[PDB]
Design an enzyme around this catalytic site. Structure first.
Site, PDB file in Angstrom:
ATOM      1  N   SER A 197       0.774  -1.087   0.035  1.00  0.00           N
ATOM      2  CA  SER A 197      -0.025   0.020   0.027  1.00  0.00           C
ATOM      3  C   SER A 197       1.029   1.094  -0.085  1.00  0.00           C
ATOM      4  O   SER A 197       1.625   1.245  -0.766  1.00  0.00           O
ATOM      5  CB  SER A 197      -0.835  -0.055   1.185  1.00  0.00           C
ATOM      6  OG  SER A 197      -1.705   1.215   0.954  1.00  0.00           O
ATOM      7  N   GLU A 324      -9.704  -4.108  -3.217  1.00  0.00           N
ATOM      8  CA  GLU A 324      -9.011  -3.007  -2.578  1.00  0.00           C
ATOM      9  C   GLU A 324      -9.794  -1.944  -2.065  1.00  0.00           C
ATOM     10  O   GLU A 324      -9.440  -1.368  -0.998  1.00  0.00           O
ATOM     11  CB  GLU A 324      -7.947  -2.364  -3.713  1.00  0.00           C
ATOM     12  CG  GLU A 324      -6.881  -3.071  -4.195  1.00  0.00           C
ATOM     13  CD  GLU A 324      -5.581  -3.457  -3.274  1.00  0.00           C
ATOM     14  OE1 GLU A 324      -5.582  -2.848  -2.239  1.00  0.00           O
ATOM     15  OE2 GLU A 324      -5.003  -4.411  -3.516  1.00  0.00           O
ATOM     16  N   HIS A 437      -7.979  -5.180   1.306  1.00  0.00           N
ATOM     17  CA  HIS A 437      -6.776  -4.376   0.760  1.00  0.00           C
ATOM     18  C   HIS A 437      -5.918  -4.877   2.392  1.00  0.00           C
ATOM     19  O   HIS A 437      -6.508  -4.633   3.491  1.00  0.00           O
ATOM     20  CB  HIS A 437      -7.137  -3.131   1.151  1.00  0.00           C
ATOM     21  CG  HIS A 437      -5.874  -2.164   1.063  1.00  0.00           C
ATOM     22  ND1 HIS A 437      -5.210  -1.870  -0.120  1.00  0.00           N
ATOM     23  CD2 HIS A 437      -5.484  -1.246   2.090  1.00  0.00           C
ATOM     24  CE1 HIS A 437      -4.310  -1.008   0.351  1.00  0.00           C
ATOM     25  NE2 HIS A 437      -4.312  -0.656   1.408  1.00  0.00           N
TER      26      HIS A 437
END
Lengths: 527, 527
Positions: A197, A324, A437
């Protein structure tokens, strides 16, 4: 002694740690920079003065000062990401897991945590390097870096808060590994940086930035890329947010010197308390203090760097998760809740699109809506919820990453692409959120191998594969010793990553990413 | 005598015609207006002076002066549309098929031919009314109207070439039916106008136009609607094209009087020979001389008329064919040919989109391309050819018609919608062209009933159904005596029309038509 290492900064004493019924060495809390405190707040880091005596490296260090998620107090799904040590501005330390007996020159892997550049900890349970170090016989490093204002407050032109200082922390840590990993049995010529990320965007930023390229060999990017729309801001936008932050704290705004002085007197939590007030839009997936295109760390715009091949050429392995966006919609979009199925009305859908694309005019918002609406079934609650999930994921993670991979692949020396779509059997977040995510990290770090954590046998198998791919890639530049195909400009192949027999596909989400990478940007440029 | 009819214009003598082993009366070539010749060229029609004696109505009349398709000399696929009588400016006649024995007060159907407002003939074999008149026991009328410049040259403000005069021809014919059909056994209170393509747009125009509404009861529209982007032009665009036409013929362009005078001295073929030179764009599906929004025939813009319900409220039956665009791509787009499968490169595809949407800026052309491209398989020749076919069909026929139906349905008194998707077994045009524009007409007129024409038994069955639907609708306002559902604002139901058991669906091509009716128009307005 196996637990004593003499480095160039001084000696360090580790601790023997148990792992899947065997043991390894852990050197936790090694300092790699001077504490960024006092007058040094917002400054570039400074290398740590060598020490005489033995540094006690047997415990985890403090986590940087950061906003703390209190959305679900007690809930493990959210709290596992929260700092698990005292926070302190004195936070610049790294952690090393070394096989036992100590290797002489092995593959090193350096983990760079995410958390949207406003949060994150090297000391999280899901980041425990002992499973991967043990299983793959790698030396595993996890570094730390300043987040929030402390890491990313940007007053371009001033030397007291230049911006990007959190990226320079990561760089100093990569410098300390370069210079010292050899004494731990690591090969400084075979370092892979990996991160998820903001950690993945960081990794891509060290590939771009000329002053970082030389300090690692290869890169793994998980659910992030440097050109993500949330991962950086202009110097002017950085400036506007540092001024607004000072406005929130009643600072004298006469000069940078006045501003910076005032901000350095405030307690960490005072900054953290008003940090979200500076965002320019009502938005989702946007973070206040992030890297700036400063003309130093990044010589030119990320895009012109990507077009010209101004970047380290090496091998890269990267990918995304299926769902996500769900986390950001949960926490920030009307109509989504942790304990319902979150079927979204059209009214909430259109509210969601506006939040997800804050920088879009009405035509742009219509273009998005049309692209993700099934007009045969436009009041389908599930289709609205999922279509919003994809909007968020696509715009923020997948399509930026797809643009990076395509551009990078033109000049790089090998690209491996994945799409992680296994939903963990013991996930505590609701079903609607899917393959969330961040939930590939626990496979990367080998948590499915510890029986007590309640994964299936096939999850353990998948973990062992992912780890072997990551570590073999780190070692050789190829995840393969069935076969994960190279991603090439023409064929554009990728593999799914799940408990099922491998499947190779091509052109990950091309329909949507042409829309996000080509059409919409053209649309907003013209209007 | 059955073949003698005394009307208000004088007596008329018909002819007995054989039909599926029985017989009916035909009154062919009845004049309904004064010949539009000499000084009367471009003028509003004038009602036909009554005659003494017996008008011989036993033969087809002349076809109006029109461009003649010579693309495939000898080929029946194209030549069946070409005039089959001498052309003449003296062309304003209608044709009546009357059951035998003569009815007293039956359903009347008035057919309005298509041909893009530049061509068309009432006398075509596929328009022979004897099968429908005989089978359905209706009185069948086919009228004629001036096409090309002769019908549609528009110099707004002048009374010598006002524009729309071809629409006034159709109206005078509908006036003559109103006033005289009773003497043929037709009920003037139960007239349906029907027409295909420009004939369908005409029908919708007589619904809109206040001076036409009162002259018919109900309407059938096949593959056309009044708001089609090719069916009308502003007064300014009409003006620019009449001036350009005169420029092509070296006219004195000093005044309308000079222009009009010069144009009235030219032989019909001189006008026809330069007629395509006046189009403003390199385009497909655009015709030079078409109806103008004059503020008379059409009081206001078609759209504001449709929004306010300024239109005849009655029942309507309407629909489209599956592959409306193939004919125009054949004749006009690079890469399509009659005797190949016409697989289109990306280069030809993009050339095709530009021709199909001449009025679009580059962003608009990108929006189209993205909407119709499969980015997983963008070099698929078939997908490119078909996607172009849909672009043409959607933009020009389907989505305009879908907009008309939705707007009309708000204020109308019943809407029946079809999607005609049977490809005739004996079609001479290649496979790639599919269910071609115009090829539902032969089912409507009952050609599958004549053995010698080589249709299957199930085609005969479909014809008999379509005819029974059209004639029952004409009679009662409902195609039903299995059941074709009403099209309503909420449910938006429609039926397919094919040799298979009926299927009801909803929202005909909504995904694409939101794009053509809502998004793209917004896009081009903003840019």
């Amino acid at each position: 002694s196996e637990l004593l290492v003499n480095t160039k900064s001084g000696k360090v004493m580790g601790t023997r740690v148990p792992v899947l019924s065997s043991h390894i060495s852990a050197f936790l809390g090694i300092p790699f920079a001077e504490p960024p405190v006092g007058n040094m707040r917002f400054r570039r880091p400074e290398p740590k003065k060598p020490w005489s005596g033995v540094w006690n490296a047997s415990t985890y260090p403090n986590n940087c000062q950061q906003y703390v998620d209190e959305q679900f107090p007690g809930f493990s799904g959210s709290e596992m990401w929260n700092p698990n040590r005292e926070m302190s501005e004195d936070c610049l330390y790294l952690n090393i897991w070394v096989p036992s007996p100590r290797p002489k020159s092995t593959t090193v892997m350096v983990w760079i945590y995410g958390g949207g550049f406003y949060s994150g900890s090297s000391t999280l349970d899901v980041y425990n390097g002992k499973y991967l170090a043990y299983t793959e016989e790698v030396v595993l490093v996890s570094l730390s870096y300043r987040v929030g204002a402390f890491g990313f407050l940007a007053l371009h032109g001033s030397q007291e808060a230049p911006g990007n200082v959190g990226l320079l922390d990561q760089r100093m840590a990569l410098q300390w590994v370069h210079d010292n990993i050899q004494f731990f049995g690591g090969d400084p010529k075979t370092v892979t940086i990996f991160g998820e990320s903001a950690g993945g965007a960081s990794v891509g930023m060290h590939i771009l930035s000329p002053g970082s390229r030389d300090l690692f060999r290869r890169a793994i990017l998980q659910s992030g890329s440097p050109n993500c729309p949330w991962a950086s801001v202009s110097v002017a936008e950085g400036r506007r947010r540092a001024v607004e932050l000072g406005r929130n704290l009643n600072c004298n705004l006469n000069s940078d010197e006045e501003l910076i002085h005032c901000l350095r007197e405030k307690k960490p939590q005072e900054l953290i308390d008003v940090e979200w007030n500076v965002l320019p839009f009502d938005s989702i997936f946007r973070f206040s203090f992030v890297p700036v295109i400063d003309g130093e760390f990044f010589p030119t715009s990320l895009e012109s760097m990507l077009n010209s091949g101004n970047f380290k050429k090496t091998q890269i392995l990267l990918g995304v998760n299926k769902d996500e966006g769900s986390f950001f919609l949960l926490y920030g979009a009307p109509g989504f809740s942790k304990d319902s199925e979150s079927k979204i009305s059209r009214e909430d859908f259109m509210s969601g699109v506006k939040l997800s694309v804050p920088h879009a005019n009405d035509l742009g918002l219509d273009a998005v809506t049309l692209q993700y609406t099934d007009w045969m079934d436009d009041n389908n609650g599930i289709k609205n919820r999922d279509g919003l999930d994809d909007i968020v994921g696509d715009h923020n993670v997948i399509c930026p990453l797809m643009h990076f991979v395509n551009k990078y692949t033109k000049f790089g020396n090998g690209t491996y692409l994945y799409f992680f779509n296994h939903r963990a059997s013991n996930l505590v977040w609701p079903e609607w959120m899917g393959v969330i995510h961040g939930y590939e990290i626990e496979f990367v770090f080998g948590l499915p191998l510890v029986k007590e954590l309640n994964y299936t046998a096939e999850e353990e198998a998948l973990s062992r594969r992912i780890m072997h791919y990551w570590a073999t890639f780190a070692k050789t530049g190829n995840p393969n010793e069935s076969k994960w195909p190279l991603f090439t400009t023409k064929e554009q192949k990728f593999i799914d990553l799940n408990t099922e027999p491998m499947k190779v596909h091509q052109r990950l989400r091309v329909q949507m990413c042409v829309f996000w990478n080509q059409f919409l940007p053209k649309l907003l440029n013209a209007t």
